[PDB]
Amino acid sequence: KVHGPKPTEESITKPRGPFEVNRRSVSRLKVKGFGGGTIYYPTNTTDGLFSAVSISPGFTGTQETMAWYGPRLASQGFVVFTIDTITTTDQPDSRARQLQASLKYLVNKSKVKDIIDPARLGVMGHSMGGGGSLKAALDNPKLKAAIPLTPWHTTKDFRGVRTPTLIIGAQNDTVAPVSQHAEPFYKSLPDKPGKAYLELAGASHLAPNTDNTTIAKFSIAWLKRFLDDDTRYDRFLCPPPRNNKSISDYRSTCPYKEH
Amino acid sequence: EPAKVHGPKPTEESITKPRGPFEVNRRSVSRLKVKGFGGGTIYYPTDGLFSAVSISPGFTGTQETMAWYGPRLASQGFVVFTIDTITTTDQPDSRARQLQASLKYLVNKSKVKDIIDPARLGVMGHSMGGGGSLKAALDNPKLKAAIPLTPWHTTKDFRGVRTPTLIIGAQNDTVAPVSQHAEPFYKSLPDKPGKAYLELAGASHLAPNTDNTTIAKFSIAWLKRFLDDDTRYDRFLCPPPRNNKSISDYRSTCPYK
Q: Is B140 on the interface with A (CB under 8 A)?
A: yes
Give strand ranges (E) for A132-201: 145-149, 165-170, 195-200
Q: Which of the residues A56, A205, A228, A230 is marked catalytic?
A: A205
Q: Exposed, middle or buried by CB within 10 Å (0-12, 13-18, 19+), for A174?
A: exposed
How many angstroms separate the CA atoms of B252 and A254, rounded? Answer: 44
Given the DSSP bridges, would you call strands A21-26 and A37-42 parallel, antiparallel or unpaired? antiparallel
CB-CB under 8 Å, B141 with A138:
no
| Chain B positions in Cβ-Cβ contact with residue A139 (cut-off 8 Å) | 157, 159-160
Q: How was this entry determined?
A: X-ray
Question: Using CB atoms, which residue from A93, A141, A160 is nearest to B157?
Answer: A93
How many angstroms separate the CA atoms of A221 and B163, rounded? Answer: 34
* Span between the terminal Cα atoms of chain A, in Å: 17
Of B94, B98, B138, which to mutate for an interface test with A (greatest number of A Cβ within 10 Å)? B138
Give residue B194's Cα distance to chain centre: 15
DSSP string, A34-75: S--EEEEEES--SSS-EEEEEEE--TT--GGGGTTHHHHHHT
Query: Resolution in angstroms, to 1 decimal, for this deposition?
Result: 1.2
Say which residues have a Cβ less than 8 Å from residue A259's Cβ, sequence separation at least 6.
A192, A193
Q: Is A109 on the interface with B (CB under 8 A)?
A: no
CB-CB under 8 Å, A139 with B157:
yes
Q: How far is CA A7 from CA A135, A178, A214, B47, in A?
A: 31, 31, 16, 60
| CA-wise closest residue to A53 among A195, A230, A173, A223 | A223
CB half-sphere exposure, B171, CA atoms < 13 A? 11
Strand partners, B50: B116
Of A154, A159, A188, which to mutate for an interface test with B (greatest number of B Cβ within 10 Å)? A159
Could you give the residue numbers annotated as active site of B? 127, 173, 205
Shortest Cα distance from B237 to chain A (angstroms)?
26
How many angstroms separate the CA atoms of A185 and A189, rounded? Answer: 7
How many angstroms separate the CA atoms of B14 and B8, rounded? Answer: 9
Q: Is B93 on the interface with A (CB under 8 A)?
A: yes
How many angstroms separate the CA atoms of A13 and A212, rounded? Answer: 10
How many angstroms separate the CA atoms of B187 and B165, rounded? Answer: 11
Phi/psi of residue A67, nearest 5 degrees: -60, -35
How many angstroms separate the CA atoms of B61 and A156, rounded? Answer: 23
Please name the residue of chain A whose CA is at the shortest distance from the CA of residue B160: A139
The residue type at A227:
L
Q: How far is CA B223 from CA B117, B133, B147, B150, in A?
A: 14, 14, 9, 17
Q: Is A156 on the interface with B (CB under 8 A)?
A: yes
Q: Exposed, middle or buried by CB within 10 Å (0-12, 13-18, 19+), for B77?
A: buried
| Chain A positions in Cβ-Cβ contact with residue B135 (cut-off 8 Å) | 157
How many angstroms separate the CA atoms of A234 and A226, rounded? Answer: 10
Q: How far is CA A211 from CA A16, A25, A51, A105, B146, in A?
A: 12, 21, 22, 27, 46
CB-CB under 8 Å, A156 with B96:
no
Q: Which helix (H) or strand (E) holds B247?
A: strand B247-252
| Residue A198 near residue A168, CB atoms below 8 Å | yes
- Taken in order of first residue, the domains within chain A and their CATH numbers are 9-252 (3.40.50.1820)
| Chain A positions in Cβ-Cβ contact with residue B123 (cut-off 8 Å) | none
Q: Exposed, middle or buried by CB within 10 Å (0-12, 13-18, 19+), for B13?
A: exposed
Shortest Cα distance from A35 to chain B (angstroms)?
20
CB-CB under 8 Å, A156 with B93:
yes
CB half-sphere exposure, B166, CA atoms < 13 A? 31
Of B90, B91, B93, B163, which to mutate for an interface test with A (greatest number of A Cβ within 10 Å)? B93
Question: Using CB atoms, which residue from A93, A96, A155 is nearest to B93?
Answer: A155
Beta carbon pairs, A and B, within 8 Å: 28
Helix ranges (H only) for B65-145 are 69-74, 92-108, 128-139
CB-CB under 8 Å, B139 with A160:
yes
Shortest Cα distance from B97 to chain A (angstroms)?
9
